[PDB]
Design an enzyme around this catalytic site. Structure first.
Site, short mmCIF file in Angstrom:
data_model
loop_
_atom_site.label_atom_id
_atom_site.label_comp_id
_atom_site.label_asym_id
_atom_site.label_seq_id
_atom_site.Cartn_x
_atom_site.Cartn_y
_atom_site.Cartn_z
N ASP A 8 1.03 7.75 5.24
CA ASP A 8 0.37 6.85 4.32
C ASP A 8 1.11 5.54 4.55
OD1 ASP A 8 -0.38 5.24 2.19
OD2 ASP A 8 0.47 6.51 0.64
N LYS A 69 0.33 -5.45 5.40
CA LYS A 69 -0.99 -4.80 5.28
C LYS A 69 -2.05 -5.80 4.79
CE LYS A 69 -2.97 -0.45 3.54
NZ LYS A 69 -2.57 0.77 2.76
N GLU A 173 -7.89 6.41 2.76
CA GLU A 173 -6.94 6.86 1.72
C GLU A 173 -7.64 7.78 0.68
OE1 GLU A 173 -5.07 3.12 0.54
OE2 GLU A 173 -4.32 2.93 2.60
N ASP A 194 -6.72 4.91 -7.81
CA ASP A 194 -5.52 4.57 -7.06
C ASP A 194 -4.86 3.29 -7.54
OD1 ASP A 194 -3.62 3.90 -5.12
OD2 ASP A 194 -4.85 4.60 -3.42
MG LIG Z 1 -1.42 3.49 -1.62
#
Ligand SMILES: [Mg+2]
Ligand SMILES: OC[C@H]1C[C@@H](Nc2ncnc3ccccc23)[C@H](O)[C@@H]1O
Length: 379
Positions: A8, A69, A173, A194
């Protein structure tokens, strides 16, 4: 043969897992932590990655990189790059419409593409897995947000190849979180909630015969755990002014040190109703020894916690589903461990149980590890 790993690669933290002996092991790093900060720092003598990089940020802000990211696979002209840059302490340069992070390293000016920074984070995760397994790791599954475009997915895959990994697949994800919970082995409608360190993502999936369909995505790319830390920072800055008659808000190091302590206190408040905050020589030799209650933290963040429900309502409308049509409510991200966030979501879904038996900070790596073991069999 050699096991494949699941990674991840998070905005703020990364996590690595391996499916071995019929179960997933989420792998602890050398400091014993099951998640590693997505940070890279450059000094006069070394390159630090993970815990050691995040730890020295207050004394080396310009050369400690994070949030790669947010840049990965984007052109410099992208509106997101244009908006995000003003909030970072490190320099972002433009090289033929490509963003690069510019730092001082071993006494020289160096610049790195976002995928080179993320490759350093992936090298760290690969090494953490090899330290546990005892042999070289070459195959991995790497996750990305459902909203990532072909350029962002390709740049993430390139980061993996730079790290010496063969990337079996780039997977979403929310799909990895649903795989972790066995939701593809039960039409199943799944809501993934999330709440991460810097982003909030709601996804609604429909799983039919092992096929995942993204029905809706909603959220806020600028809402996460860091924003709750900052509500505590502001509260404490005011407390320091009241007690000592000194304003610390313009001292960059003091604010950074206070923020680090606030994050620790916030984590404690998820399992205890009070947390101590103790900083030695915060400002002008003054020790700041205090505490905060869970009720006060909840008051300080009340608007933010409530705001997590609008994206849920929006995603349900876009997916054309009622609350009762959603089979599973899956928690992802350490911020979902906050009791008030769980209570708000449960109340919205009229008291229904939440899927939270897998550590929310590890569920995405867990699902990626399960999928990696399935795919390596096919090769
Ligand atoms: Mg995350
Ligand atoms: O994904 C990175 C996020 C998650 C957040 N962690 C936590 N945030 C809140 N409560 C926690 C309780 C136990 C462990 C971790 C907790 C951490 O501080 C950061 O903001």
């Amino acid at each position: 043969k050699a096991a494949a790993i699941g990674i991840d690669l998070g905005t703020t933290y990364s996590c690595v897992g391996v499916f071995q002996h019929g179960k997933v092991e989420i792998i602890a790093n050398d400091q014993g932590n099951r998640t590693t900060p997505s940070y890279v720092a450059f000094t006069d003598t070394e390159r630090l990655i993970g815990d050691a990089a995040k730890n020295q940020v207050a004394l080396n802000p310009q050369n400690t990189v994070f949030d790669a990211k947010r840049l990965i696979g984007r052109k410099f002209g992208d509106p997101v790059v244009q908006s995000d840059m003003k909030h970072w302490p490190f320099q972002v340069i433009n090289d033929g419409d490509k963003p690069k992070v510019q730092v001082s390293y071993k006494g020289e000016t160096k610049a790195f593409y976002p995928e080179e920074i993320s490759s350093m984070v992936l090298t760290k995760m690969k090494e953490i897995a090899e330290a546990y397994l005892g042999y070289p790791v070459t195959n991995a599954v790497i996750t990305v947000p459902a909203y990532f475009n072909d350029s962002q997915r390709q740049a993430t895959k390139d980061a993996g190849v730079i790290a010496g990994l063969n990337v079996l697949r780039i997977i979403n994800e929310p799909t990895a979180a649903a795989i972790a919970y066995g939701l593809d082995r039960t039409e199943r409608n799944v809501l993934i909630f999330d709440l991460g360190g810097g982003t909030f993502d709601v996804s609604i999936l429909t799983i039919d015969d092992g096929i995942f369909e993204v029905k809706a995505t909603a959220g806020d790319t600028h809402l996460g755990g860091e924003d709750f830390d900052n509500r505590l920072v502001n509260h404490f800055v005011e407390e320091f002014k009241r007690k000592h008659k000194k304003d610390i808000s313009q001292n960059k190091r003091a604010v950074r040190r206070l923020r680090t302590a606030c994050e620790r206190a916030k984590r404690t408040l998820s399992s205890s109703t009070q947390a101590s905050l103790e900083i030695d020589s915060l400002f002008e030799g003054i020790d700041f020894y205090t505490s905060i209650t869970r009720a006060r933290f909840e008051e300080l963040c009340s608007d933010l916690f409530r705001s997590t429900l609008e994206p849920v309502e929006k995603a349900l409308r876009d997916a054309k589903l009622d609350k009762a049509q959603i089979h599973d409510l899956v928690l992802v991200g350490g911020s979902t461990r906050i009791p008030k966030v769980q209570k708000l979501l449960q109340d919205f879904f009229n008291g229904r149980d939440l899927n939270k038996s897998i550590n929310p900070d590890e569920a995405v790596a867990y699902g990626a590890a399960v999928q990696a073991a399935i795919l390596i069999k096919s090769t």
